[PDB]
Design a protein around this ligand. Structure first.
Ligand code: CLA
Ligand code: CLA
Ligand code: CLA
Ligand code: CLA
Ligand code: CLA
Ligand code: CLA
Ligand code: CLA
Ligand code: CLA
Ligand code: CLA
Ligand SMILES: CCCCCCCCCCCCCCCCCC(=O)OC[C@H](CO[C@@H]1O[C@H](CO)[C@H](O)[C@H](O)[C@H]1O)OC(=O)CCCCCCCCCCCCCCCCC
Lengths: 75, 89, 179, 731, 30, 161, 35, 80
C-alpha cells in the first residue's frame, strides 16, 4: 500500500505538471509543430537555458514520457 | 667506526690529514679558498664583458676555473675548522 | 625585574615561548629559550643602531643631520644602502665581512642554543672590552642587562614604526607632530 | 625437483594446471627457488644480465638490418622532408589485393612506415648509406655473440666470480662512473667530432680514411698546448645547408645555444662540447671511492658519519650500507627510480630541445617518442616502489636499521600516508571541481563565468629563462640583470632566439588550460605515490594484519574474517597503482598530444579555450581526431591506416576482456569448470582422451595479474593506434 | 644496395648466435 | 596586464563575447511577441547577461586573447578578490565547521553510549557548540598551547613497524 | 628488395613451424615426470 | 599441504575446531590457559585453507593461523 501510495503520488504529479507546467493545450491544436514539454526550470545560476523553445508560446524541458499522446487518446 | 654521538663528530671524520690540523690553520685556509674563489668569479665576470677577451670562450682561464673550485674547498675547510675546534685540535 | 610595564610577571599572551614543549609533534622545530633570548637581544641591538641611523641621517626637523664627507649623498634611508654598496664596494664588503665573522663566531664557540645546549649566557658576545662586569657590582650589571633589553624592545617598536610608515602611510599618527 | 617447475618442489607436486602457470611466473624469482644460495644467486643474475644485454644488441642489429635491406634510408637522406621512413616490409598471405596497394603507396612492396625516429637519429650521427647501416648491424650481431659467450663463460667453475667481487661497491662505482659513463661519453665525443660533424659539413669520414683526415684544420695541437679556443673559432653559418659544405664552419666544440636554423635541431658542436664536459665530470666522479690504492672514500664510513647532531634524523644513515649491500631489491628499486626519472626527463627534453635533424618536423614520430618514453617511465616508477615493497618484506632488518632514516619512515608511516591522503584529496576535490564548474557554465551558455587560473609560476620560469611574451622582465627576459649580461657572451643569443621563436617546442606558451591539467597530473602523481607508499610502508603489517611479513609479498587475502581482507598484500597495492599509473600517463600524453595537435594544426587557441572543461577533451580532442582512425577501413574501402583502426578495436577488446578477470572472481569459475570436467568424463569418444593436469580456475592473485595485463595491453594498444593514426591521418 | 651474399652472411652469424644463446640458456638452467 | 594579459574593460574579445551572447538571446526573443512570459523571461536574461558583463569590466579582471577573465593567484593584493579574499572566507567557514565537529565529538565522547549521540544528534548541545565556532582561531591556538589539541604518541594506536 | 624470396620462406617458419615446434616441446617438457 | 599453527594465546574456547569443515583441528589437554585445553592441528593434510578457524578465533590477533602453502588434490578441494 505504501508503494501504491508512492505511485499515485507520482501519477498525480505528472497530471499536475501537465495541467500547470505544460503546453498541452497548444499541443492539442497542433501536434506536429509543437514539441511536448511538461517540466519548467527556475531561473537560477544559468540553468534557464534548459527551457527549450518548444512552441505554443511556452518554454520548458522537452519531456519524452508520452503523456500528451496518452491524454489525447483518453479524450 | 665512524658513528658518533653528542654535538660534534670526532676528528677522524676529516680523513687522515685534516684530523691532525689545527682549527685556526683550517680556518685561515678556508678564508684563503673563499677569497680565491670570489676573486676568480669576479675576474671571470670582467673577462666575459671585456670586448676583446670573450670570443670563442677566451674568457675561460685555467687559473680562474681552478681558483673558482676554492668555493667548495672553502665550505669544507670551514666545516673542518669547526670540528677541530670542538675537538680541542 | 624587567616586567614592570606588563604587571610584575613575564608577558607572553600568545605563549610563543612555550611552543617547543607544548606538544611532541615537531621535535626541535621551535627554538628553546636560549635562542629566543639571544634573538631578542640581537634584534634589539640591531634596532638600537638602526633607529639611530635613521635619526642621525634625517635632514628634516627634530632629526639631527649628521653626514660623513666622502659618503654618498642620499638622505632617504630606504635607498641609502644601494647607493653605498655601489659607490663604496670595498668598504661595504669590509663591513659585511666583519658582520659575517662576528655573527659566525657568536655561535661557533658555543653550542646549540636552539636546543638549549649552549655554554654561554645569551647576549654575551665577549665584547665587554672596557670594564665593566669586573668593575661594577653584580646587581648593577644585572640592571644594565634589563636596560639594554628594554631599550632594545623600544627601538624594535620604533623600527616597526618606521617600517609601517613606508608601507601604510597612516600607521603612526604621532610621527606627524615632528614635522 | 622432477616434474617442472624444477626450482619449486611445492609447485612441482601440484596436481592441477596451477603448476604450469605458477612455474612460468616464478621462474625469475631466483631468491625464492629451492636450494638457492647467495653465491649462486649473484652468478645466475650476472649471467642472465649478459643474456639481456645480447637481446638489446640483437634488437638493435635488427632495426639496422631491416632499414638497410627493406627501408629507404638513402632516399630519406636525399629528401628528408618528403620521404616517409620505412620500418620493414610486409609479407602477409591474409592481405587482399587492395591492402597490398594501400601499404605500397610510394614503394614497390608493402611497407610499414617507421615512427621510432631511427632515421633522424642515424642521419644525425653520420650514417648516409645502406652499406654503413649494414656494417653496423653486423658488428652488433657479433657483439651480442660475445655477450652470449661471456654469460656462458662466467658460469664455468673457474670463472664464476666470488660473492666478495659482487659486493665490491667501491670498485664498481669507480669503474661505472669512469669507464661506463665518462669514457663512453668521451668516446662518443670522439665519434661525433671525427664522423658526425664532418658528415653534417659535407665531408665523408669513414673507416677507410679516418686515420689520415683530421677533424679540425689545426689538428690536436691546440688541445695539448691549452689553446682550446681554436676549437670554437668559426661555427656553421645561419645559412649553412645541412649535410653540405656550403656555409659550413670548422669549429668542433662550441657553446652556441639554440638550434641549427635549417634542421631546427641542436648543433653537433654543442653536443660534442656537452658530451666532452659530461665525460670529464664523470671521469673525475669515478675518483671518489677507495679501491686497492689507499686513497678514496669508504662508503660505510660516509653513511655512518652522516647523522645530524640536532637529532632530527635519529641515528642518521648508520646501517644503511649493510642494508643496501645485502638487498638486491633495494638496489633494484633505487635503480628503477632513477631510470624512471631519466626516462621522464628523456621525453620532456627530446620534444623541447630537439636533438636530431628534422625530428621536430616528423609529427607522428615526435608523438610516438614522447608517448613511448612516458609510458616506459611510468612502468619503471611503479617497479621501483614495487621492489621497494619487496625489500621491506624480504630484506629489511629492523635491528640493523635501528633508529636510522630508514626505520623512522615506518615509525611515522601513518603521518606520511594520511598527508599523502590529504594532498590527493585536496587536488582531486578542487581540480575535478574546477573542471565541472567550467563544464557547467559553458554548457549553460556563460563561458565568461569560468574559473581560469593563470599559471603565473610556470610563466615566471619561462620569463626567467628569457621568454618575452609574458612581459615579466625578470632574469633573462630583462637585459639589465647580471644573469643576462654574463651569458650574452656565451650561449644566450642562440638560446634567446630559440626560446622566443613561437614555432618550436622550447617553453610552449601556456595558459589556464595548462593550469588545470598540471593539477590533474599532480593529482595522478600523488595518488599513484600514495598507493605505492602505503604498499611499501604497510608491507610488513597493519592493524588488520599485524603479521603480514610472515605471509610474504604476494598472497590472495587473509580470508573473510575480521571484516574481510581482499587485496591486503603489498603486491595488491602494486596492482592498484598500475591503474593509477596508466591513468596518470594517460592524462600526461593526452595533454601533450592535444596541445601539439593544435599547434601543428595551426589553431593553438582551440586548446586554450576547450581544455578548461572536460567536454572540450571529449569533443575537440577524442571525437574530432578519431575521424581518420576509424575510417581506416569502411564499407567503401581501406587505406594504410587500416592496421591502426584494427589495432584500435583490438585494443578496446583486450581492455574489456581484462574487466572480466578484474570483476568476476574465482569461486564462480571453479564451480563452472567442475561441470565441464563432468561433461568430458561423461561424453563418449572424448572419453578416449584425458588431461594430465586437473583443470582448475586461475588463482586469486593470478587473475588479478591476468586482468591487469589485459587492461594494460589494451590501454597501450588503443592509444598507440590512436596517437599514430591521428597524427599520420591529419599530417 | 645490400647484396644477396650480405644477407646470407648475417644469417650465418645469427644462427651462430642462436647456438650461443642455447648454450647460455642451458648453463643458466643447470 | 600582469602575464601578458589585458584588462577585460580594454579587450575587444571580451566586448565581442558580450555582443554575441546578447545577440543570441535577442534572436530568441524576436520569435515571441511583446507581453508573453517567454519574452518577459528572455528580457530578464538579457538584463542579467548585460549586468554580468558590465560587472566583470569594471572589476580588475584580466582577460586573455580568448576574451575570458583569468584569475591571478600568486599572492598579490591587487588581485586579492579573486583568490585570497574568497580564500580567507573559506578558511574561516571550513575551520568553523571542523572545529565544532571536533568539539561536539569530544563533548559526547564522555557520555554513556557515545555512538548513539552521533547517529541521534543531541541538537541543543550541538546548536550550542556550533555557535562557539566563530572564534575558532582563538580557541585552536588556546588548545594547541594547553595540550588539548594534540594527543601524545603513547595514547594513539599504531601498527607493527 | 634484394633477396625478395626470403620473407616467403622465413615468415611461415617463424609464424607457423617454430611455434608448432616450441609449443610441442614445452608441452612435452611440462608433462615429464622426471626432470 | 597448508600450514596451521597454534600460538599460546589460545584460551581453549574450541570454536576453531567447531568451524573446521575438513577436521584438521582437535582439542588436546593443556595447562597454559584456565580452560585446560589448547587447539592442535594433527591433520593438516586435509586443510583446504578456508580460514573458518581464523574467523572463529576470539583472541586478539588469532591463536590459529593458516599459512597457505603447497596445493594438493585435497588442499584444492577437487572432487575430480
Ligand atoms: C476483486 C477485488 C480485488 C481487486 C480489485 C484487487 C486488487 C489488488 N490487489 Mg487483491 N486481493 C483480493 C481482491 C482484489 N484485489 C482478495 C479477495 C484477496 C484475498 C485472497 C486479495 C489479496 C491481496 C494481497 C495479499 C495483495 C493484493 C494486492 C492487490 C493490488 C495489486 C497491485 C496492482 O496491480 O494495483 C493496481 C492499482 C489499482 C487498481 C488502484 C485501485 C485500488 C483499489 C482497486 C481501489 C481502492 C479505492 C477504493 C475506493 C477503496 C490490486 C489493487 C497487492 C497489493 O498491492 O496490496 C496493496 C497485494 O500484496 N490483493
Ligand atoms: C677593491 C676592490 C673591489 C671591487 C671592485 C668590488 C666590487 C663589488 N663587490 Mg666586493 N669586496 C671587496 C672589494 C671589492 N669589491 C672586499 C675588500 C670585500 C671584503 C672581503 C668584498 C666583499 C663583498 C661582498 C660580501 C659582496 C661584494 C659585492 C661586490 C659587487 C657590488 C655590486 C652591488 O653592490 O650591487 C648591489 C645591487 C644594487 C645596489 C641594486 C639595488 C638598488 C635598488 C634600487 C634597491 C631597492 C631596495 C632593495 C630592493 C632593498 C634590498 C634590501 C636587502 C638587500 C636587505 C661589486 C662588483 C657584492 C656582490 O655582488 O657579490 C656577489 C657582495 O654581496 N663584495
Ligand atoms: C649551507 C651549508 C653550510 C653549513 C652546513 C655550514 C656550517 C657551519 N658554518 Mg658556515 N657558512 C655558509 C654555509 C654553511 N655553513 C655560508 C653560505 C656562509 C656565508 C658565506 C657561511 C659563513 C660562515 C661564517 C662566517 C662562519 C660559519 C661557521 C659554520 C660552522 C658553525 C655554525 C655557524 O655559525 O654557521 C652559520 C651559517 C649560516 C647561518 C649560513 C648558512 C645558511 C644556509 C645558506 C642555509 C641553506 C642551506 C641549503 C639547504 C643548501 C645550501 C645552498 C648553498 C648554495 C648556500 C658550521 C660548521 C662558523 C665557523 O665555525 O667557521 C669556522 C663561522 O664563523 N659559516
Ligand atoms: C683570530 C683570533 C680569534 C680567536 C682565538 C678567537 C676566540 C674566540 N672568540 Mg672570536 N672573534 C674574532 C677572532 C678570534 N676569536 C674576530 C676576528 C671576531 C670578529 C670581530 C670575533 C668575534 C667574536 C664574537 C661575537 C664571539 C667570539 C667568541 C670567541 C670565543 C669562542 C670560545 C669561547 O670562549 O666561548 C665561551 C666559552 C664558554 C662559555 C665555555 C673564543 C675565545 C665568542 C665569545 O667570546 O663568547 C663569550 C663570541 O660570542 N669572537
Ligand atoms: C689521465 C689522467 C688520470 C690520472 C692522473 C689518474 C689517477 C688515478 N687514478 Mg684514474 N682513471 C682515469 C684517468 C686518470 N687517473 C680514467 C680516464 C679512468 C676511467 C674513468 C680511470 C679509472 C680509474 C679507476 C677505476 C681507479 C683509478 C684510480 C686512480 C688513482 C690511483 C692512485 C695511485 O697512485 O695508483 C697506483 C698507480 C696505478 C694504478 C697506475 C695507473 C695510474 C694512471 C695515472 C692511470 C691511467 C690513466 C690513463 C688511462 C693513462 C694515460 C695517462 C698518462 C699515463 C699518459 C690515481 C689518482 C684508482 C683509485 O683509487 O681512485 C680513487 C682506481 O680504483 N682510475
Ligand atoms: C670500466 C670498466 C667497466 C665497464 C665499461 C663496465 C660495464 C658494465 N658493467 Mg660493470 N663492473 C666493473 C667494471 C666495468 N663495468 C667492475 C670493476 C666490477 C666489479 C667491482 C663490475 C661489476 C659488475 C656487475 C655485477 C654487473 C656489471 C654490469 C655492467 C654492464 C651494465 C649494464 C649496461 O650495459 O648498461 C650500460 C649503460 C650505459 C652505457 C648508459 C647509461 C645510461 C644511464 C641511464 C645514464 C644516466 C646518467 C646520466 C649520464 C646522468 C643523469 C641524468 C640527469 C640529468 C638526471 C656494463 C656493460 C652488469 C651486467 O649487465 O653484466 C653483464 C652487472 O650485473 N658490472
Ligand atoms: C660511444 C662510443 C661510440 C659509439 C656508440 C660509436 C658508434 C658508431 N660509430 Mg663511431 N667512433 C668512435 C666512438 C663511437 N662510435 C670513436 C672513439 C672513434 C675514433 C675517433 C670512432 C670513429 C668511427 C669511424 C671512422 C666510423 C665510426 C662508425 C660508427 C657507427 C657504426 C660502427 C660499427 O659498425 O661498429 C660495430 C660495433 C661494434 C663492433 C661494437 C663495439 C663494442 C665495444 C668495442 C665494446 C656507429 C654509429 C662508422 C660509421 O658508419 O659512421 C656513420 C664509421 O665509419 N666511428
Ligand atoms: C573516474 C573514476 C575515479 C574517481 C573519481 C576516483 C576517485 C578517487 N580515488 Mg579511485 N580508483 C579508480 C577510479 C576513480 N577513483 C580505479 C579505476 C581504481 C583501480 C581499482 C582506483 C583505485 C584507487 C586507489 C587504490 C585509491 C584511489 C583513491 C581515490 C580518491 C583520490 C583522492 C581525491 O582525488 O579526492 C577527490 C574526490 C573525488 C575525485 C571523488 C568525489 C568527487 C565529488 C563527488 C565531487 C567533488 C566536487 C565538489 C568539490 C563537491 C562539493 C559539493 C558540496 C559537498 C559542497 C578519489 C576518491 C585513493 C584515496 O582514497 O586517497 C585518499 C586511493 O588510495 N582509487
Ligand atoms: C610558488 C611559490 C610562491 C609562494 C608560496 C608565494 C607566496 C606569497 N606571495 Mg607570491 N609570487 C610568486 C610565487 C610565490 N608566492 C611568483 C613566482 C610571483 C611573480 C609572478 C609572485 C608575485 C607576487 C607579488 C607581486 C606579491 C606576492 C605576494 C605573496 C604573499 C601573499 C601575501 C600573504 O602571505 O597572505 C605570499 C607569501 C604578495 C606579498 O606580499 O609578497 C611579500 C605580493 O604583493 N607574490
Ligand atoms: C699560516 C700557517 C700557520 C697557520 C697556523 O698554524 O696558525 C698559527 C697562528 C695561530 O695558531 C693556532 O694555534 C692554536 C693553538 O694555539 C691551534 O693550534 C691552531 O691550529 C693554530 O692555527 O695563526 C696565525 O696567527 C697565522 C696568521 C697568518 C695569516 C695572517 C692573515
Amino acid at each position: 500500500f505504501g508503494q501504491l501510495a508512492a505511485i499515485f503520488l507520482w501519477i498525480s504529479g505528472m497530471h499536475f505538471h501537465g495541467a500547470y507546467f505544460s503546453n498541452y493545450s497548444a499541443w492539442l491544436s497542433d501536434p506536429i509543430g509543437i514539441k511536448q514539454s511538461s517540466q519548467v526550470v527556475w531561473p537560477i545560476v544559468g540553468q534557464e537555458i534548459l527551457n527549450a523553445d518548444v512552441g505554443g508560446n511556452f518554454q520548458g524541458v522537452q519531456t519524452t514520457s508520452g503523456w500528451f499522446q496518452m491524454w489525447r487518446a483518453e479524450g | 667506526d665512524m658513528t658518533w654521538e653528542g654535538e660534534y663528530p670526532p676528528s677522524k671524520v676529516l680523513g687522515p690529514i685534516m684530523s691532525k690540523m689545527p682549527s685556526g690553520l683550517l680556518g685561515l685556509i678556508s678564508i684563503a679558498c673563499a677569497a680565491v674563489c670570489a676573486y676568480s668569479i669576479a675576474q671571470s665576470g670582467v673577462l666575459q664583458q671585456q670586448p676583446g677577451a670573450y670570443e670563442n670562450g677566451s674568457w675561460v682561464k685555467w687559473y680562474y676555473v681552478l681558483g673558482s673550485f676554492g668555493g667548495p674547498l672553502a665550505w669544507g675547510t670551514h666545516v673542518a675548522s669547526w670540528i677541530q675546534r670542538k675537538n680541542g685540535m | 625585574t624587567g616586567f614592570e610595564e606588563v604587571g610584575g610577571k613575564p608577558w607572553d599572551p600568545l605563549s610563543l615561548g612555550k611552543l617547543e614543549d607544548a606538544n611532541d609533534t615537531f621535535p626541535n622545530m621551535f627554538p628553546k629559550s636560549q635562542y629566543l633570548q639571544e634573538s631578542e637581544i640581537k634584534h634589539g641591538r640591531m634596532c638600537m643602531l638602526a633607529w639611530t641611523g635613521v635619526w642621525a641621517t634625517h635632514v628634516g626637523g627634530m632629526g639631527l643631520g649628521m653626514h660623513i664627507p666622502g659618503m654618498p649623498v642620499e638622505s632617504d634611508w630606504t635607498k641609502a644602502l644601494g647607493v653605498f654598496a655601489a659607490e663604496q664596494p670595498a668598504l661595504f664588503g669590509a663591513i659585511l665581512l666583519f658582520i659575517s665573522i662576528a655573527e659566525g663566531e657568536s655561535v661557533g664557540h658555543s653550542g646549540d642554543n636552539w636546543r638549549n645546549m649552549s655554554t654561554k649566557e645569551p647576549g654575551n658576545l665577549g665584547f665587554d672590552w672596557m670594564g665593566l662586569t669586573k668593575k661594577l657590582s653584580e646587581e648593577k650589571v644585572a640592571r644594565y642587562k634589563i636596560v639594554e633589553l628594554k631599550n632594545g624592545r623600544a627601538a624594535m617598536i620604533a623600527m616597526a614604526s618606521l617600517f609601517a610608515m613606508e608601507a601604510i602611510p597612516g600607521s603612526v599618527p604621532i610621527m606627524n607632530v615632528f614635522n | 625437483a622432477t616434474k617442472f617447475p624444477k626450482f619449486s618442489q611445492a609447485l612441482a607436486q601440484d596436481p592441477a594446471t596451477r603448476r604450469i602457470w605458477y612455474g612460468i611466473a616464478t621462474a625469475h624469482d631466483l631468491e625464492a627457488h629451492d636450494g638457492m644460495t647467495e653465491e649462486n644467486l649473484y652468478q645466475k643474475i650476472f649471467a642472465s644480465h649478459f643474456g639481456h644485454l645480447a637481446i638489446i644488441f640483437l634488437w638493435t642489429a635488427g632495426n639496422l638490418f631491416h632499414v638497410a635491406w627493406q627501408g629507404n634510408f638513402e632516399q630519406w637522406v636525399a629528401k628528408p622532408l618528403k620521404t616517409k621512413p620505412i620500418a620493414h616490409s610486409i609479407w602477409d598471405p591474409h592481405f587482399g589485393e587492395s591492402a597490398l596497394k594501400a601499404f605500397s603507396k610510394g614503394n614497390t612492396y608493402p611497407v610499414n612506415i617507421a615512427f621510432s625516429g631511427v632515421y633522424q637519429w642515424w642521419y644525425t650521427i653520420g650514417f648516409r648509406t645502406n652499406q654503413e647501416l649494414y656494417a653496423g648491424s653486423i658488428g652488433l650481431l657479433a657483439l651480442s655473440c660475445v655477450l652470449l659467450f661471456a654469460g656462458w663463460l662466467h658460469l664455468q667453475p673457474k670463472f664464476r666470480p666470488s660473492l666478495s667481487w659482487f659486493k665490491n661497491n667501491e670498485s664498481r662505482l669507480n669503474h661505472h662512473l669512469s669507464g661506463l659513463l665518462g669514457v663512453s661519453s668521451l668516446a662518443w665525443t670522439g665519434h661525433i667530432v671525427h664522423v658526425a660533424i664532418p658528415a653534417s659539413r659535407g665531408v665523408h669520414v669513414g673507416w677507410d680514411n679516418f686515420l689520415t683526415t683530421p677533424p679540425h684544420p689545426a689538428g690536436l695541437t691546440p688541445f695539448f698546448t691549452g689553446n682550446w679556443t681554436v676549437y670554437a673559432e668559426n661555427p656553421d653559418s645561419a645559412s649553412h645547408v645541412y649535410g653540405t659544405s656550403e656555409g659550413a664552419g670548422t669549429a668542433i666544440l662550441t657553446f652556441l645555444g639554440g638550434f641549427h636554423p635549417q634542421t631546427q635541431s641542436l648543433w653537433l658542436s654543442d653536443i660534442a662540447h656537452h658530451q666532452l664536459a659530461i665525460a670529464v665530470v664523470f671521469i673525475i666522479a669515478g675518483h671518489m671511492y677507495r679501491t686497492n690504492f689507499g686513497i678514496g672514500h669508504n662508503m660505510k664510513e660516509i653513511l655512518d658519519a652522516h647523522r645530524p647532531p640536532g637529532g632530527r634524523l635519529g641515528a642518521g644513515h648508520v646501517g644503511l650500507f649493510e642494508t643496501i649491500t645485502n638487498s638486491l631489491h633495494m638496489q633494484l628499486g633505487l635503480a628503477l627510480a632513477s631510470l624512471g626519472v631519466a626516462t621522464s626527463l628523456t621525453a620532456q627534453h627530446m620534444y623541447a630541445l630537439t636533438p636530431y635533424a628534422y625530428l621536430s618536423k616528423d609529427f607522428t614520430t615526435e608523438a610516438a617518442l614522447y608517448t613511448h618514453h612516458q609510458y616506459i617511465a611510468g612502468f619503471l616508477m611503479v617497479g621501483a616502489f614495487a621492489h621497494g615493497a619487496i625489500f621491506f618484506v624480504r630484506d629489511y632488518d629492523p635491528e640493523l636499521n635501528k633508529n636510522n632514516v630508514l626505520a623512522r619512515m615506518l615509525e611515522h608511516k601513518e603521518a606520511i600516508i594520511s598527508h599523502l591522503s590529504w594532498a590527493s584529496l585536496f587536488l582531486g576535490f578542487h581540480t575535478l571541481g574546477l573542471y565541472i564548474h567550467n563544464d557547467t557554465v559553458v554548457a549553460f551558455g556563460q563561458p565568461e563565468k569560468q574559473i581560469l587560473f593563470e599559471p603565473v609560476f610556470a610563466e615566471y620560469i619561462q620569463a626567467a629563462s628569457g621568454k618575452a611574451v609574458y612581459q615579466f622582465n625578470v632574469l633573462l627576459s630583462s637585459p639589465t640583470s647580471p644573469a643576462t649580461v654574463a651569458g650574452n657572451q656565451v650561449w644566450l643569443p642562440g638560446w634567446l632566439d630559440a626560446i622566443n621563436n613561437p614555432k618550436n617546442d622550447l617553453f610552449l606558451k601556456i595558459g589556464p588550460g595548462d593550469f588545470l591539467v598540471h593539477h590533474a597530473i599532480a593529482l595522478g602523481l600523488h595518488v599513484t605515490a600514495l598507493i605505492l607508499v602505503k604498499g611499501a610502508l604497510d608491507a610488513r603489517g597493519s592493524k588488520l594484519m599485524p603479521d603480514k611479513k610472515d605471509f610474504g609479498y604476494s598472497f590472495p587475502c587473509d580470508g573473510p574474517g575480521r571484516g574481510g581482507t581482499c587485496d591486503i598484500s603489498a603486491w595488491d597495492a602494486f596492482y592498484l597503482a598500475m591503474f593509477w599509473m596508466l591513468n596518470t600517463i594517460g592524462w600526461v600524453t593526452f595533454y601533450w598530444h592535444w596541445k601539439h595537435m593544435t599547434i601543428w594544426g595551426g589553431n593553438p587557441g582551440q586548446f586554450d579555450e576547450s581544455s578548461n572543461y572536460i567536454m572540450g577533451w571529449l569533443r575537440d580532442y577524442l571525437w574530432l581526431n578519431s575521424s581518420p582512425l576509424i575510417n581506416g577501413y569502411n564499407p567503401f574501402g581501406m587505406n594504410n591506416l587500416s592496421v591502426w583502426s584494427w589495432m584500435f578495436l583490438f585494443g578496446h577488446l583486450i581492455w574489456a576482456t581484462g574487466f572480466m578477470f578484474l570483476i568476476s572472481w574465482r569461486g564462480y569459475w571453479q564451480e563452472l569448470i567442475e561441470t565441464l570436467v563432468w561433461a568430458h568424463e561423461r561424453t563418449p569418444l572424448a572419453n578416449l582422451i584425458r588431461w594430465r593436469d586437473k583443470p582448475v580456475a586461475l588463482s586469486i592473485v593470478q587473475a588479478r595479474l591476468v586482468g591487469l595485463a589485459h587492461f594494460s595491453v589494451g590501454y597501450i594498444l588503443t592509444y598507440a593506434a590512436f596517437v599514430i593514426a591521428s597524427t599520420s591521418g591529419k599530417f | 644496395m645490400i647484396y644477396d651474399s650480405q644477407v646470407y652472411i648475417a644469417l650465418v652469424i645469427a644462427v651462430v648466435a642462436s647456438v650461443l644463446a642455447i648454450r647460455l640458456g642451458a648453463t643458466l638452467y643447470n | 596586464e600582469i602575464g601578458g594579459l589585458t584588462k577585460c574593460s580594454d579587450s575587444p574579445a571580451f566586448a565581442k563575447r558580450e555582443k554575441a551572447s546578447i545577440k543570441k538571446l535577442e534572436q530568441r526573443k524576436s520569435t515571441y511577441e511583446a507581453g508573453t512570459p517567454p519574452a518577459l523571461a528572455l528580457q530578464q536574461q538579457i538584463e542579467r547577461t548585460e549586468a554580468r558583463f558590465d560587472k566583470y569590466s569594471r572589476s580588475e579582471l584580466l582577460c586573455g586573447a580568448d576574451g575570458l577573465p583569468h584569475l591571478i593567484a600568486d599572492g598579490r593584493w591587487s588581485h586579492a578578490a579573486e583568490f585570497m579574499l574568497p580564500g580567507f572566507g573559506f578558511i574561516y567557514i571550513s575551520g568553523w565547521i571542523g572545529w565544532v565537529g571536533r568539539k561536539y565529538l569530544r563533548a559526547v565522547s564522555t557520555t554513556k553510549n557515545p555512538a548513539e549521540s552521533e547517529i541521534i544528534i543531541n541538537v541543543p548541545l550541538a546548536l550550542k557548540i556550533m555557535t562557539t565556532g566563530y572564534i575558532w582561531p582563538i580557541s585552536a591556538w588556546e588548545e594547541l598551547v594547553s595540550g588539548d589539541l594534540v594527543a601524545l604518541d603513547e595514547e594513539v594506536t599504531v601498527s607493527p613497524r | 628488395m634484394a633477396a625478395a624470396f626470403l620473407p616467403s620462406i622465413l615468415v611461415p617458419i617463424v609464424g607457423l613451424i617454430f611455434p608448432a615446434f616450441s609449443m610441442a616441446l614445452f608441452f612435452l617438457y611440462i608433462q615429464q615426470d622426471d626432470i | 599441504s597448508h600450514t596451521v599453527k597454534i600460538y599460546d594465546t589460545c584460551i581453549g574456547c574450541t570454536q576453531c575446531v567447531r568451524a573446521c569443515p575438513t577436521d584438521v583441528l582437535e582439542m588436546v589437554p593443556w595447562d597454559g590457559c584456565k580452560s585446560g585445553q589448547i587447539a592442535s592441528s594433527p591433520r593438516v593434510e586435509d586443510c583446504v585453507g578456508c580460514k573458518r578457524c581464523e574467523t572463529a578465533c576470539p583472541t586478539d590477533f588469532l591463536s590459529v593461523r593458516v599459512y597457505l602453502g603447497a596445493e594438493t588434490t585435497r588442499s584444492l578441494g577437487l572432487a575430480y
